[PDB]
Symmetry: C3
């Protein structure tokens, strides 16, 4: 139990098939659907329906959280109201794999310009650091203004997150205390 966690999951797929007859309905419905916390993702999967008619299966990824069923019903109705569907199907995950994680803002200086990079550190009970991941968009965007390559920012930042230090890119240093 002190490797990967494997627990019951509150993730579900909410699924409905729409005729492509109602044109700007799906983009609009998705934009309202994502406004709520528990909707993780939306995708309209293109499909062939019954009289060789093009459809989309609207697929909504939902984190139920503490109470799934209130959340599932709220989203199901949203789907119904927003799309005109009267049949929304629900698919539950049989379990979720997880590792405890935390975030760590790492201070980056280049002599005269500075940033703060988010670093997710995923660590098990046993002390296995499975991932230390500096947020890449910040790393590459620093990698521009500095010039020096994005992945060396990443490597330095992640090593700084390990010892709780900060990065001086100008002298190639990680400073602890």
């Amino acid at each position: 139990s002190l490797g990967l966690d494997y627990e019951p999951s509150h993730l579900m797929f909410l699924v409905t098939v729409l005729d492509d007859r109602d044109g700007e309905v799906l983009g609009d419905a998705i934009q309202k659907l994502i406004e709520r916390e528990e909707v993780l993702a939306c995708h309209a999967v293109p499909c062939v329906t019954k009289k060789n008619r093009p459809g989309h299966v609207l697929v909504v990824l939902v984190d139920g959280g503490e109470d799934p069923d209130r959340v599932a019903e709220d989203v199901a109705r949203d789907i119904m109201v927003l799309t005109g569907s009267t049949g929304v199907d629900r698919f539950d995950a049989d379990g979720v794999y997880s590792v405890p994680s935390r975030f760590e803002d790492v201070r980056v200086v280049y002599g005269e310009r500075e940033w703060r990079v988010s670093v997710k550190i995923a660590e098990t009970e046993e002390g296995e650091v499975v991932t230390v991941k500096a947020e890449f968009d910040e790393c590459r965007e620093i990698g521009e203004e500095t010039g020096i390559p994005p992945r060396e920012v990443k490597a330095m930042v992640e090593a700084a997150a390990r010892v709780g230090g900060w990065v001086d890119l100008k002298e190639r240093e990680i400073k602890v205390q």
Copy 2:
């Protein structure tokens, strides 16, 4: 129980992975697959298979209806016969959200030209009309020949479905009796 219905579902995903080695097999198989009532949708999802080979996961959305298993088996064999697969996997929905609905043909006149528009009215036990949806393709296609915008056809038709009347677009009227 007199809001949304949440009942056991006879919807299933029939899933098989195909090598892209057999070229015009998938379009043809889908065209035969959709010929039966209970196949709701088909999509070949592009995927990366095992020796960096491109595949498709053929995904068939099936309404089992009264007896799922006879329907599921018939479709599974069709998939097998049509594609050469010998392994078809089945994924059942854990439940379906639903609202009772009915259809209502609304008579539309523009002085000298007329149509009939299908309007789905979805209404719960409590009397909450969650959706009144005029079929959009008809609404926009009327919206052409008339000139006047498709969504005002929609709004007028849906209001006519509410009181069981008919639409006179020429004088901007909904007539009840």
Copy 3:
């Protein structure tokens, strides 16, 4: 029971939602993911995430085989290590439809050039040969060098697999013994 087999399935979908923030992570992760036997397919499904941000739901199709849970966990960790995700969800098939199958190499000669074509023969207990499928890529690629159409190679090869013979395309013959 001597038609289609319908047995418990060791197939699962491993699902994780990624921000598109980490750029060349998905192609690389998929290329490592497919290296193991039990990963059947990988696809990153494009999706709309929470602050109208584009995401992908990485979807990994996994044959658990004899022990699913060791295989599932190994893949889940791979997903976690390779992508930085700390939440991998698991969806089990409710059953698999199957027909016993075997392969049969069919010798093809055109007077002076020869090949061996793989033919899958799927046959039930009752003796229903549901599919006899010559591997199409070989059939069409023979169909080139020979000139004569790919589907007549297929038909001849499949008929040869039936009687355990071999194909002489030059004299239009299937020879048994």
